[PDB]
């Protein structure tokens, strides 16, 4: 998703209070603000090198990561600039002294810093409410391939 047009909305997309003076001629054009989210999390290169905009991007945006931090694997990429992860986990029934498989499906807004794919585990930091569903934000991507290369052409 994202991945072109930068301007595609009827609204002109820009970072708040980051001003490019027209009279002062710059060869970089855009002056692009960022930070590092903290909590020992790398603000990735593409957040800086990128041309993108989104204000829900915890590195270039106005949302701050605090509270829980969660691991889980991506089951759905179908939404633009957000995704749903399945964090499974086991539940202990005291009577039977056993465990039963459970899961909870967490929608989380993926900044357009990351290329996320289905099957990739992802680390996710908690943030302020973003959409109806999403209280969490993609932070680190733990799987760069997930078998992608082992599928290969004939010879």
């Amino acid at each position: 998703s994202t991945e072109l047009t930068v301007q595609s909305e009827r609204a002109f997309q820009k970072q708040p209070h980051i001003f490019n003076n027209p009279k002062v001629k710059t060869s970089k054009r855009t002056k692009r603000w960022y930070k590092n989210a903290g909590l020992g999390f790398k603000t990735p290169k593409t957040a800086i090198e990128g041309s993108y905009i989104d204000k829900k991007c915890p590195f270039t945006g106005l949302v701050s990561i605090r509270g829980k931090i969660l691991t889980g694997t991506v089951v759905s990429t179908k939404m633009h600039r957000t995704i749903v992860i399945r964090r499974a986990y086991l539940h202990y029934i005291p009577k039977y002294n056993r465990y039963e498989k459970r899961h909870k499906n967490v929608p989380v807004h993926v900044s357009p810093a990351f290329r996320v794919q289905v099957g990739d585990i992802v680390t996710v930091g908690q943030c302020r409410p973003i959409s109806k569903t999403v209280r969490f934000n993609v932070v680190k991507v733990s799987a760069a391939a997930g078998k992608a290369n082992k599928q290969f052409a004939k010879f």
Binding site: F12, P22, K23
Partner: protein, 188 residues
């Protein structure tokens, strides 16, 4: 009245939620100001915990900053040429945040040709002094320049007039003024 509660609506699963308790005064919402131009008239909502807010409707004047000139002057608002949310706001010339207006340019033209003297478009002792200390910065931009002939400048409302009672904002400049310039005459 209006309620911003999520107790209405539905589940994320798409389940109907039952009616639980009632509306509370703190889930509350109120009507749109739908602020307009002309004849300044403003009503004041008394909000949660004292905290007056200020309802703009009919404001004909507001303070607009020149982004790259580091100066700000209050002007007239001449209309609305664009708006990203609904086109009906441009037609009705309703004033909202991020609404694209036209302003005056004359308080900006009076000030530029004083601070500089370059007579957009188109003798005192210490005057020629600072006039000469200036320029080199007098180039401005063609796209702000050419506007000045018409006598109306493209501004953008940066405030929330129904909330704050004021209509303020900045002159469209650089990339924005470049972008709206497309949709402006690619719609008109």
């Amino acid at each position: 009245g209006i309620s911003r509660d999520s107790r209405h609506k539905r589940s994320a699963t798409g389940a109907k939620r039952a009616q639980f308790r009632k509306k509370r005064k703190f889930e509350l919402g109120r009507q749109p100001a739908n602020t307009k131009i002309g004849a300044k008239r403003i009503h004041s909502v008394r909000t949660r915990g004292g905290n007056k807010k200020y309802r703009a409707l009919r404001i004909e004047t507001g303070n607009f900053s020149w982004a790259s000139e580091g100066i700000s002057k209050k002007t007239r608002i001449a209309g609305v040429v664009y708006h990203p949310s609904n086109n009906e706001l441009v037609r009705t010339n309703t004033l909202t945040k991020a609404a694209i207006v036209q302003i005056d340019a004359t308080p900006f033209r009076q000030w530029f040709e004083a601070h500089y003297g370059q007579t957009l478009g188109k003798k005192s002792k210490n005057a020629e002094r600072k006039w000469a200390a200036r320029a080199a910065s007098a180039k401005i931009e063609s796209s702000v320049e050419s506007q000045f002939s018409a006598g109306r400048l493209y501004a953008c409302i940066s405030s929330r007039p129904g909330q704050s009672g004021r209509c303020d904002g900045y002159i469209l400049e650089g990339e924005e003024l470049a972008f709206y310039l497309r949709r402006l005459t690619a719609k008109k």
